[PDB]
mmCIF file of all heavy atoms in Angstrom:
data_model
loop_
_atom_site.group_PDB
_atom_site.id
_atom_site.type_symbol
_atom_site.label_atom_id
_atom_site.label_comp_id
_atom_site.label_asym_id
_atom_site.label_seq_id
_atom_site.Cartn_x
_atom_site.Cartn_y
_atom_site.Cartn_z
ATOM 1 N N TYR A 895 -54.993 -13.466 37.972
ATOM 2 C CA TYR A 895 -54.124 -12.401 37.483
ATOM 3 C C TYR A 895 -53.161 -12.877 36.410
ATOM 4 O O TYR A 895 -53.057 -14.073 36.140
ATOM 5 C CB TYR A 895 -53.340 -11.834 38.672
ATOM 6 C CG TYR A 895 -52.621 -10.523 38.436
ATOM 7 C CD1 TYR A 895 -53.310 -9.394 37.995
ATOM 8 C CD2 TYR A 895 -51.261 -10.393 38.729
ATOM 9 C CE1 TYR A 895 -52.664 -8.163 37.858
ATOM 10 C CE2 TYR A 895 -50.611 -9.169 38.596
ATOM 11 C CZ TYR A 895 -51.316 -8.060 38.165
ATOM 12 O OH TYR A 895 -50.678 -6.844 38.063
ATOM 13 N N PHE A 896 -52.471 -11.928 35.791
ATOM 14 C CA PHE A 896 -51.488 -12.243 34.768
ATOM 15 C C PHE A 896 -50.272 -12.829 35.490
ATOM 16 O O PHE A 896 -50.149 -12.692 36.705
ATOM 17 C CB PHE A 896 -51.092 -10.970 34.022
ATOM 18 C CG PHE A 896 -52.235 -10.311 33.306
ATOM 19 C CD1 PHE A 896 -52.753 -9.103 33.754
ATOM 20 C CD2 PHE A 896 -52.796 -10.905 32.185
ATOM 21 C CE1 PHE A 896 -53.812 -8.488 33.094
ATOM 22 C CE2 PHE A 896 -53.857 -10.304 31.516
ATOM 23 C CZ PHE A 896 -54.366 -9.087 31.973
ATOM 24 N N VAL A 898 -47.481 -12.104 36.602
ATOM 25 C CA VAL A 898 -46.561 -11.055 37.036
ATOM 26 C C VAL A 898 -46.830 -10.737 38.493
ATOM 27 O O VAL A 898 -47.869 -11.109 39.030
ATOM 28 C CB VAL A 898 -46.736 -9.755 36.221
ATOM 29 C CG1 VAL A 898 -46.664 -10.058 34.743
ATOM 30 C CG2 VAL A 898 -48.052 -9.100 36.564
ATOM 31 N N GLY A 900 -46.645 -7.436 39.819
ATOM 32 C CA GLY A 900 -47.489 -6.260 39.677
ATOM 33 C C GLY A 900 -48.364 -5.845 40.844
ATOM 34 O O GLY A 900 -47.896 -5.718 41.969
ATOM 35 N N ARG A 901 -49.647 -5.627 40.564
ATOM 36 C CA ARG A 901 -50.600 -5.204 41.581
ATOM 37 C C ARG A 901 -51.131 -6.295 42.508
ATOM 38 O O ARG A 901 -52.033 -6.047 43.305
ATOM 39 C CB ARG A 901 -51.780 -4.464 40.930
ATOM 40 C CG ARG A 901 -51.493 -3.008 40.564
ATOM 41 C CD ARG A 901 -52.705 -2.351 39.888
ATOM 42 N NE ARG A 901 -52.511 -0.919 39.672
ATOM 43 C CZ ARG A 901 -52.512 -0.008 40.643
ATOM 44 N NH1 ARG A 901 -52.698 -0.372 41.907
ATOM 45 N NH2 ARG A 901 -52.317 1.269 40.355
ATOM 46 N N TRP A 926 -56.230 -13.531 27.361
ATOM 47 C CA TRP A 926 -56.824 -12.226 27.606
ATOM 48 C C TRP A 926 -57.259 -11.562 26.301
ATOM 49 O O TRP A 926 -58.332 -10.964 26.229
ATOM 50 C CB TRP A 926 -55.828 -11.337 28.355
ATOM 51 C CG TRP A 926 -56.394 -10.020 28.812
ATOM 52 C CD1 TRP A 926 -56.107 -8.782 28.306
ATOM 53 C CD2 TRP A 926 -57.338 -9.810 29.874
ATOM 54 N NE1 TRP A 926 -56.808 -7.817 28.986
ATOM 55 C CE2 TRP A 926 -57.574 -8.416 29.953
ATOM 56 C CE3 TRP A 926 -58.009 -10.661 30.763
ATOM 57 C CZ2 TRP A 926 -58.453 -7.854 30.889
ATOM 58 C CZ3 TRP A 926 -58.888 -10.098 31.698
ATOM 59 C CH2 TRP A 926 -59.100 -8.706 31.749
ATOM 60 N N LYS A 932 -61.990 -10.571 29.848
ATOM 61 C CA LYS A 932 -61.967 -9.116 29.948
ATOM 62 C C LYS A 932 -63.375 -8.523 29.971
ATOM 63 O O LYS A 932 -63.669 -7.645 30.785
ATOM 64 C CB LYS A 932 -61.185 -8.516 28.780
ATOM 65 C CG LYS A 932 -61.111 -6.997 28.810
ATOM 66 C CD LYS A 932 -60.192 -6.462 27.726
ATOM 67 C CE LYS A 932 -60.232 -4.942 27.666
ATOM 68 N NZ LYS A 932 -59.771 -4.301 28.932
ATOM 69 N N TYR A 937 -64.393 -3.730 35.539
ATOM 70 C CA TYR A 937 -63.729 -2.596 34.922
ATOM 71 C C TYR A 937 -62.830 -3.074 33.791
ATOM 72 O O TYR A 937 -61.891 -2.381 33.401
ATOM 73 C CB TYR A 937 -62.908 -1.834 35.961
ATOM 74 C CG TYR A 937 -63.718 -1.313 37.133
ATOM 75 C CD1 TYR A 937 -63.515 -1.806 38.424
ATOM 76 C CD2 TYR A 937 -64.667 -0.308 36.956
ATOM 77 C CE1 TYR A 937 -64.240 -1.303 39.518
ATOM 78 C CE2 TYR A 937 -65.392 0.201 38.035
ATOM 79 C CZ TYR A 937 -65.175 -0.299 39.313
ATOM 80 O OH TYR A 937 -65.891 0.219 40.373
ATOM 81 N N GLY A 938 -63.122 -4.267 33.278
ATOM 82 C CA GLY A 938 -62.349 -4.828 32.180
ATOM 83 C C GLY A 938 -60.876 -5.071 32.470
ATOM 84 O O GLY A 938 -60.061 -5.118 31.546
ATOM 85 N N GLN A 939 -60.529 -5.232 33.743
ATOM 86 C CA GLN A 939 -59.140 -5.460 34.124
ATOM 87 C C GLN A 939 -58.971 -6.484 35.239
ATOM 88 O O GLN A 939 -59.939 -6.900 35.877
ATOM 89 C CB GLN A 939 -58.495 -4.143 34.566
ATOM 90 C CG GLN A 939 -58.436 -3.073 33.482
ATOM 91 C CD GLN A 939 -57.501 -1.937 33.850
ATOM 92 O OE1 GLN A 939 -57.710 -1.237 34.846
ATOM 93 N NE2 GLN A 939 -56.453 -1.753 33.049
ATOM 94 N N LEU A 940 -57.726 -6.899 35.450
ATOM 95 C CA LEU A 940 -57.382 -7.837 36.511
ATOM 96 C C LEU A 940 -56.481 -7.042 37.452
ATOM 97 O O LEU A 940 -55.905 -6.029 37.051
ATOM 98 C CB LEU A 940 -56.639 -9.051 35.943
ATOM 99 C CG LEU A 940 -57.427 -9.942 34.973
ATOM 100 C CD1 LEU A 940 -56.534 -11.077 34.471
ATOM 101 C CD2 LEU A 940 -58.662 -10.497 35.672
ATOM 102 N N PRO A 941 -56.289 -7.517 38.693
ATOM 103 C CA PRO A 941 -56.816 -8.723 39.328
ATOM 104 C C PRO A 941 -58.299 -8.841 39.638
ATOM 105 O O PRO A 941 -59.002 -7.856 39.859
ATOM 106 C CB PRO A 941 -55.992 -8.812 40.604
ATOM 107 C CG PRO A 941 -55.844 -7.375 40.975
ATOM 108 C CD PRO A 941 -55.448 -6.768 39.643
ATOM 109 N N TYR A 951 -62.935 -6.814 42.578
ATOM 110 C CA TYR A 951 -62.021 -6.278 41.570
ATOM 111 C C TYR A 951 -61.363 -5.085 42.254
ATOM 112 O O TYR A 951 -61.865 -4.620 43.278
ATOM 113 C CB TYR A 951 -62.780 -5.815 40.329
ATOM 114 C CG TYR A 951 -63.411 -6.943 39.555
ATOM 115 C CD1 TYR A 951 -64.742 -7.299 39.773
ATOM 116 C CD2 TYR A 951 -62.671 -7.682 38.628
ATOM 117 C CE1 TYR A 951 -65.329 -8.363 39.086
ATOM 118 C CE2 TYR A 951 -63.248 -8.749 37.931
ATOM 119 C CZ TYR A 951 -64.582 -9.081 38.168
ATOM 120 O OH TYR A 951 -65.176 -10.121 37.482
ATOM 121 N N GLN A 952 -60.255 -4.604 41.688
ATOM 122 C CA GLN A 952 -59.494 -3.471 42.221
ATOM 123 C C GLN A 952 -58.514 -3.937 43.299
ATOM 124 O O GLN A 952 -58.913 -4.364 44.387
ATOM 125 C CB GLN A 952 -60.426 -2.394 42.792
ATOM 126 C CG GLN A 952 -61.228 -1.613 41.751
ATOM 127 C CD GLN A 952 -60.356 -0.712 40.891
ATOM 128 O OE1 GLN A 952 -59.183 -0.479 41.201
ATOM 129 N NE2 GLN A 952 -60.931 -0.183 39.815
ATOM 130 N N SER A 953 -57.224 -3.852 42.990
ATOM 131 C CA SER A 953 -56.182 -4.278 43.915
ATOM 132 C C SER A 953 -56.306 -3.704 45.331
ATOM 133 O O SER A 953 -56.125 -4.434 46.304
ATOM 134 C CB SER A 953 -54.802 -3.947 43.342
ATOM 135 O OG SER A 953 -54.628 -2.549 43.210
ATOM 136 N N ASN A 954 -56.616 -2.417 45.460
ATOM 137 C CA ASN A 954 -56.740 -1.827 46.791
ATOM 138 C C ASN A 954 -58.014 -2.237 47.519
ATOM 139 O O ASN A 954 -58.074 -2.179 48.745
ATOM 140 C CB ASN A 954 -56.621 -0.305 46.716
ATOM 141 C CG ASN A 954 -55.229 0.128 46.299
ATOM 142 O OD1 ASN A 954 -54.243 -0.252 46.936
ATOM 143 N ND2 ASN A 954 -55.137 0.906 45.227
ATOM 144 N N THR A 955 -59.027 -2.653 46.768
ATOM 145 C CA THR A 955 -60.271 -3.124 47.369
ATOM 146 C C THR A 955 -59.952 -4.485 47.998
ATOM 147 O O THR A 955 -60.381 -4.789 49.107
ATOM 148 C CB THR A 955 -61.391 -3.265 46.302
ATOM 149 O OG1 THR A 955 -61.851 -1.962 45.924
ATOM 150 C CG2 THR A 955 -62.570 -4.079 46.841
ATOM 151 N N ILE A 956 -59.178 -5.297 47.288
ATOM 152 C CA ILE A 956 -58.792 -6.609 47.802
ATOM 153 C C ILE A 956 -57.952 -6.432 49.076
ATOM 154 O O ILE A 956 -58.136 -7.160 50.055
ATOM 155 C CB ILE A 956 -57.971 -7.404 46.761
ATOM 156 C CG1 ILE A 956 -58.775 -7.544 45.469
ATOM 157 C CG2 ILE A 956 -57.617 -8.786 47.314
ATOM 158 C CD1 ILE A 956 -57.989 -8.143 44.321
ATOM 159 N N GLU A 985 -50.311 4.190 46.631
ATOM 160 C CA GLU A 985 -50.984 4.080 45.340
ATOM 161 C C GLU A 985 -50.555 5.190 44.376
ATOM 162 O O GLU A 985 -50.322 4.928 43.198
ATOM 163 C CB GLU A 985 -52.500 4.111 45.540
ATOM 164 C CG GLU A 985 -53.337 4.180 44.260
ATOM 165 C CD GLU A 985 -53.180 2.975 43.347
ATOM 166 O OE1 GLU A 985 -52.761 1.897 43.828
ATOM 167 O OE2 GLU A 985 -53.497 3.103 42.141
ATOM 168 N N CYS A 989 -48.610 4.449 40.832
ATOM 169 C CA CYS A 989 -49.158 4.871 39.545
ATOM 170 C C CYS A 989 -48.108 5.560 38.675
ATOM 171 O O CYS A 989 -48.096 5.395 37.456
ATOM 172 C CB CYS A 989 -50.362 5.801 39.745
ATOM 173 S SG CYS A 989 -51.917 4.961 40.171
ATOM 174 N N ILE A 992 -45.765 2.728 37.540
ATOM 175 C CA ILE A 992 -46.341 1.950 36.454
ATOM 176 C C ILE A 992 -46.300 2.765 35.165
ATOM 177 O O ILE A 992 -46.111 2.224 34.073
ATOM 178 C CB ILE A 992 -47.793 1.547 36.784
ATOM 179 C CG1 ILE A 992 -47.786 0.504 37.911
ATOM 180 C CG2 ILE A 992 -48.486 0.994 35.547
ATOM 181 C CD1 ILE A 992 -49.167 0.186 38.480
ATOM 182 N N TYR A 996 -44.287 1.304 31.782
ATOM 183 C CA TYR A 996 -44.970 1.064 30.522
ATOM 184 C C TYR A 996 -45.068 2.245 29.557
ATOM 185 O O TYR A 996 -45.338 2.042 28.379
ATOM 186 C CB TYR A 996 -46.379 0.528 30.804
ATOM 187 C CG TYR A 996 -46.413 -0.755 31.608
ATOM 188 C CD1 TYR A 996 -46.531 -0.724 32.996
ATOM 189 C CD2 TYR A 996 -46.316 -2.001 30.985
ATOM 190 C CE1 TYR A 996 -46.553 -1.892 33.748
ATOM 191 C CE2 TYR A 996 -46.338 -3.185 31.734
ATOM 192 C CZ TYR A 996 -46.457 -3.117 33.117
ATOM 193 O OH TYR A 996 -46.475 -4.264 33.875
ATOM 194 N N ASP B 1319 -62.809 2.935 44.157
ATOM 195 C CA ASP B 1319 -61.565 2.736 43.413
ATOM 196 C C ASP B 1319 -61.828 2.948 41.923
ATOM 197 O O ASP B 1319 -60.996 3.514 41.204
ATOM 198 C CB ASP B 1319 -60.992 1.333 43.661
ATOM 199 C CG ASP B 1319 -60.387 1.188 45.044
ATOM 200 O OD1 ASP B 1319 -60.214 2.215 45.737
ATOM 201 O OD2 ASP B 1319 -60.075 0.053 45.445
ATOM 202 N N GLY B 1320 -62.987 2.491 41.458
ATOM 203 C CA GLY B 1320 -63.327 2.680 40.060
ATOM 204 C C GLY B 1320 -63.497 4.165 39.780
ATOM 205 O O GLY B 1320 -63.066 4.671 38.741
ATOM 206 N N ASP B 1323 -60.033 5.804 39.580
ATOM 207 C CA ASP B 1323 -59.330 5.501 38.336
ATOM 208 C C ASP B 1323 -59.748 6.450 37.211
ATOM 209 O O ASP B 1323 -58.900 7.005 36.508
ATOM 210 C CB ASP B 1323 -59.607 4.060 37.885
ATOM 211 C CG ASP B 1323 -58.773 3.032 38.633
ATOM 212 O OD1 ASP B 1323 -57.903 3.421 39.437
ATOM 213 O OD2 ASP B 1323 -58.988 1.825 38.399
HETATM 214 N N1 GSH C 2074 -56.993 0.294 39.494
HETATM 215 C C1 GSH C 2074 -56.950 -1.152 39.144
HETATM 216 C C2 GSH C 2074 -56.022 -1.302 37.927
HETATM 217 C C3 GSH C 2074 -56.003 -2.673 37.277
HETATM 218 C C4 GSH C 2074 -55.063 -2.775 36.099
HETATM 219 O O1 GSH C 2074 -54.374 -1.800 35.713
HETATM 220 N N2 GSH C 2074 -55.028 -3.968 35.522
HETATM 221 C C5 GSH C 2074 -54.170 -4.270 34.383
HETATM 222 C C6 GSH C 2074 -53.024 -5.199 34.844
HETATM 223 S S1 GSH C 2074 -52.020 -4.511 36.212
HETATM 224 C C7 GSH C 2074 -54.968 -4.924 33.262
HETATM 225 O O2 GSH C 2074 -55.913 -5.674 33.543
HETATM 226 N N3 GSH C 2074 -54.581 -4.645 32.009
HETATM 227 C C8 GSH C 2074 -55.250 -5.224 30.845
HETATM 228 C C9 GSH C 2074 -56.321 -4.347 30.211
HETATM 229 O O3 GSH C 2074 -56.466 -3.170 30.607
HETATM 230 O O4 GSH C 2074 -57.023 -4.844 29.306
HETATM 231 C C10 GSH C 2074 -56.404 -1.970 40.347
HETATM 232 O O5 GSH C 2074 -56.067 -1.361 41.368
HETATM 233 O O6 GSH C 2074 -56.314 -3.207 40.272
#
Side-chain angles (χ1 to χ4, degrees):
Chain A
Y895 193 56
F896 298 110
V898 308
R901 281 179 173 288
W926 187 251
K932 180 173 174 62
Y937 301 114
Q939 298 194 298
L940 296 178
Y951 292 95
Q952 289 292 347
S953 64
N954 293 305
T955 286
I956 303 172
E985 173 63 21
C989 281
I992 290 171
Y996 301 93
Chain B
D1319 287 349
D1323 280 355

